[PDB]
Structure 1
Amino acid sequence: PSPNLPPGFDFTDPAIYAERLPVAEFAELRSAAPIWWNGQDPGKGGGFHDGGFWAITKLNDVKEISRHSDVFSSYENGVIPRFKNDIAREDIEVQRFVMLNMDAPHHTRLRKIISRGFTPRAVGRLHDELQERAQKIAAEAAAAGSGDFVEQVSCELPLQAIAGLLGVPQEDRGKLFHWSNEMTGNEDPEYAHIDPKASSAELIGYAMKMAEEKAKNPADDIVTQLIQADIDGEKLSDDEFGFFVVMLAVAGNETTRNSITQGMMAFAEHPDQWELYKKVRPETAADEIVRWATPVTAFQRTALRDYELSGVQIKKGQRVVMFYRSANFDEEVFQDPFTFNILRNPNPHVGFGGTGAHYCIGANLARMTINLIFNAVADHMPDLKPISAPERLRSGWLNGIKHWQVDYTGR
């Protein structure tokens, strides 16, 4: 029995996500075809010209793929499942220079070096400054009475986390945030004029200059840790640091931002959860917010050899697309997945990916950011109420909210 889906439906179709999350369609696959070939017509494969991909909709299959990185490659085709249909293959293969799109052993060496910048000590050291900034952001927004929750609440704190992690001076954070914002969303008409190619080049150039400068004058931020050789002589080259910063500018910006926006959207839809949050302030809320928001709808892998996955024969060279948005509502794993429950514990969501070599290195920085900003929202605008429906982002792999008008005072 084939799944009940519109003909030619592509789960990476940006025109879908500009309007809605295809929640019913994902649930139909989970019930009727949990691993399903998503065919793609000629020239409509978002930069990939192989006829289609395997849609992966169950959490256990997402985890099995993520664990078997020896078979399911990030390097072969990158992990972004959709670009502009016209993108040149060389523009996809340039993504291989960031650690996200690397396989072992190159990924193994890089991740070990990058780990110096994401130790619990390195992240926890940002706590106090990010808490202060979260409080000031929410106070400034509440003083405005009403406005765009996305721009006035969700946007700044994730960017300040990247800036503080890297130790970017305050006078430079303006153009750093601009470059980071010009990296994503260019298939939405609102961002048709952004140039991620130019921005990534500017980010790399800025980052190399910063690596050269930071080598001359070490400090305590992670940049010194990254470019300092260890006992084995391992360190980031200047351009390697540049590719790290470009990855960070994307990895930590719109992901946490959209978790914040869609976390508040869930709170507006479930006022009992919001009342419970304001009273208890449970930090388990962050993980339920990420599960609910699933800012990365999907990442892909490519099979390096034949592999049988849950009774389905994946053939060498074929792409599998891990739909975290489907897996995070898998009825087999979650008790009442469609109930927003900020006390859910344990919460084995795959919003940060499936356990494995590429698991989000900034997951705890993200959770801290989310907890600090929602404590600040609760402190300064506890009676927030939405004014109109959110405006969704036209993207085939990012689940984004561009704008969301709310009344911070409630009256």
Structure 2
Amino acid sequence: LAPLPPHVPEHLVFDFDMYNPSNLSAGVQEAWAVLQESNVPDLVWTRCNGGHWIATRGQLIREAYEDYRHFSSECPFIPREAGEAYDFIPTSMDPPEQRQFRALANQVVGMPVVDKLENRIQELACSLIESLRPQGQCNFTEDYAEPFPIRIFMLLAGLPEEDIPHLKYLTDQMTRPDGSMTFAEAKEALYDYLIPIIEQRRQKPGTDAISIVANGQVNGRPITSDEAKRMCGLLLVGGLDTVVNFLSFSMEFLAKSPEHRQELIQRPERIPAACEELLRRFSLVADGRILTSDYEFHGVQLKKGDQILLPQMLSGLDERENACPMHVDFSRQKVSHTTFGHGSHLCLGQHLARREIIVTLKEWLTRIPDFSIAPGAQIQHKSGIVSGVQALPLVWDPATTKAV
């Protein structure tokens, strides 16, 4: 717990810890949404993790992400030492500077590339699922949630699959630190890995994501090796720690809700609308910004240098944004969320993520329409910059499945 700063008033202190929230055993989304109870203000100060503001409502999250003159991306992580070490491109830059780097990034992970990767996504999801189908059981986090998104990413990056254990270890210490490494050691270990590769593909340009970035142009000028590395690192974390977690939340829920499985088996054309609704209910990212100057926002005096966590996860969870927000409803008419961010840094990998999610639900339910949590398992969730599921044991009767 850190010393409450002179400028923060006693009545806005709410000691929420993002890496280990109090109600965590009820579900990570449920743990986070304690900040939306009737007793809690729209903007609190927490003394954990060195101290930082936290906006709790969708209205303030969106306003702050839009206002980059006051809410800067220069130090976007908590704790303070992680945000100061954070130098990924484009995420650590504010517009106007940030803008030229998005279109290089858009070229390696945007729609055009989802279109080059279309066959391979479909094939690996069918082949992974078909290999599990006859067993009548799986450890989903390890058997599908990781290998499906991860092997597509390594394929696109032109990186070998036995580098996976090392890279996921490191990427995961930057979002859910276990204590062994600091964000900076983790980051420098990712750059160390990328350095020879980047230089080699600048001499012999290939077709893979690293070559494209490294030999890319930024509003007409050549990107440097240091910029290539800083953009490249960011793509790996996005590739190895986003969709991987998201798929486990969605499959846990489907395993617990036979009527929602039935809806999608009956009307598979509803899968894209259902993916959106699940992205709202099982939203999982929470990063933030730093104040560029002293500023008064929604009646609270903020101080230059203060950090503020603006939980992207909380906006679609807000009862002011969606009625009965904890309830999953695939026909929800206005699905409002900030799952993929808001403002000028809107997620560049969202078209890739949505395709991987929709391909997984359609291809799973086609082959293994009925499935449940294994008898007597209690699912445990984990919290951090990106939230996730520690293990998900699923069971099914092989007599009810079909090889497609």
Structure 2 match to 1:104: 95
Identity %: 21
Once residues 260 and 344 of structure 1 are traced to their aligned partners in structure 2, the CA distance between those partners, rounded to angstroms, is 21
Give the drift of 1:232: 4.9
Cα shift readout 1:284-332 (whole Å, capped 9, x = no counterpart): 2222222122121x21211212344334343333222112332221112
Match of residue 10 from structure 1: 16
CA distance in 1, matches of 2:43, 2:186: 36
Residue 86 (structure 2) pairs with residue 80 (structure 1): no
**Partner of 2:91: helix, strand, or coil?**
helix
Residues 299, 321 of structure 1: 8 Å contact kept: yes
Q: Distance in 1 between matches of 2:122 and 2:76?
A: 33
The superposition leaves residues 4-53 of structure 1 with CA deviations (integer Å, 9 ceiling, x where unpaired) of 99x9632425253753436377356353444232231xxxx42x4xxx32
Q: Partner residue of 1:67?
A: 66
In structure 1, the partner of 2:233 is: 246
Q: 1:326 to 1:184 in 2, by over 3 A?
A: same
Asked if structure 2 preserves the Cα contact closer than 8 Å seen for 1:35 and 1:57, the reply is: yes
Q: 1:368 corresponds to which letter in structure 2? A: R
Q: 1:136 to 1:361 in 2, by over 3 A?
A: same
TM-score in terms of structure 2 length:
0.84
Shift of 1:115: 2.2
- Name the SS of the counterpart of 1:147 in structure 2: strand
1:148 deviates by 1.1
In 1: Cα distance, 2:368 partner to 2:181 partner: 33
1:397 to 385, 400, 404: 385
Contact 2:381–2:390 (CA under 8 A) maintained in structure 1: yes
> Which residue of 256, 279, 293 corresponds with 2:282?
293
Could you tell me how far 1:113 is from its partner in structure 2?
Answer: 2.4
2:171/2:240 contact within 8 Å kept: no
285 and 165 in structure 1: CA distance in 2 versus 1, 3 angstrom threshold: farther
CA distance in 2, matches of 1:408, 1:371: 21
Of 45, 65, 72, the residue aligned with 1:38 is 45
Partner of 2:171, secondary structure, is: coil
1:340 aligns with 2:347: no
Give the paired residue count.
386
Report how far residue 349 of structure 1 moved: 1.0
Deviation at 1:378, TM superposition (A): 0.8
C-alpha change, 1:339 and 1:196, in structure 2 (3 Å) is same
The one-letter code matched in structure 2 to 1:295 is L
Mapped to 1, the partners of 2:176 and 2:289 lie a distance apart of 25
For 2:242, what is the secondary structure of its paired residue?
helix
Indicate the larger mover: 149-158 or 230-239: 230-239
Deviations 1:177-208 (A, max 9, x none): 5312332258979x555786565444323433
Shift of 1:375: 1.5
* Cα distance between partner residues in 2 of 1:280 and 1:217: 48
After superposition, the C-alpha distances for 1:185-234 in whole angstroms (9 at most, x for unaligned) are: 58979x55578656544432343333333334434444443233548543
1:79 Cα offset (Å): 1.9
* SS state at 1:37 partner: strand
Partner residue of 2:151? 160
Going from structure 1 to structure 2, the CA distance change for 1:347 and 1:124 (only over 3 Å counts) comes to farther
Q: In 2 relative to 1, CA 317–252 (structure 1 residues): closer, same or farther, beyond 3 Å?
A: same
- State the shift of 1:261 in Å: 0.7
Bigger mean CA deviation after superposition, 305-314 or 124-133:
305-314
Q: Is the 8 A contact 1:262 1:293 kept in 2?
A: yes
What SS does the corresponding residue of 1:104 show, helix, strand or coil? coil
**Residues 72 and 94, structure 2, Cα contact 8 Å, conserved in 1:** yes
Q: Residue 390 of structure 1: SS of its match in structure 2? A: coil
Answer yes or no: is the 8 Å Cα contact 2:372–2:396 preserved in 1: yes
* RMSD over aligned Cα atoms: 3.1
User: 1:110-189 maps to which residues of 2 (within 5 A)?
Assistant: 110-168=101-159, 172-185=160-173
Map of 1:55 onto structure 2: 54
| Mapped partners of 1:353, 1:366: distance in 2 | 13
**Does residue 1:23 correspond to 2:30, yes or no?**
yes
Secondary structure, in 3 states, of the residue corresponding to 1:100? coil
- Determine the C-alpha separation between the residues in 2 that align with 1:231 and 1:399: 33
Deviation at 1:270, TM superposition (A): 2.7
Show the 5 A alignment for 1:272-311.
272-281=259-268, 282-296=271-285, 298-311=286-299
Give the equivalent residue in structure 1 for 2:395: 407
Residues 1:320 and 2:320 are matched in the alignment: no
**Which one-letter code corresponds to 1:243 in the other structure?**
R
Offset of 1:97 from its aligned partner?
Answer: 4.1
- Which residue identity is paired with 2:392? W
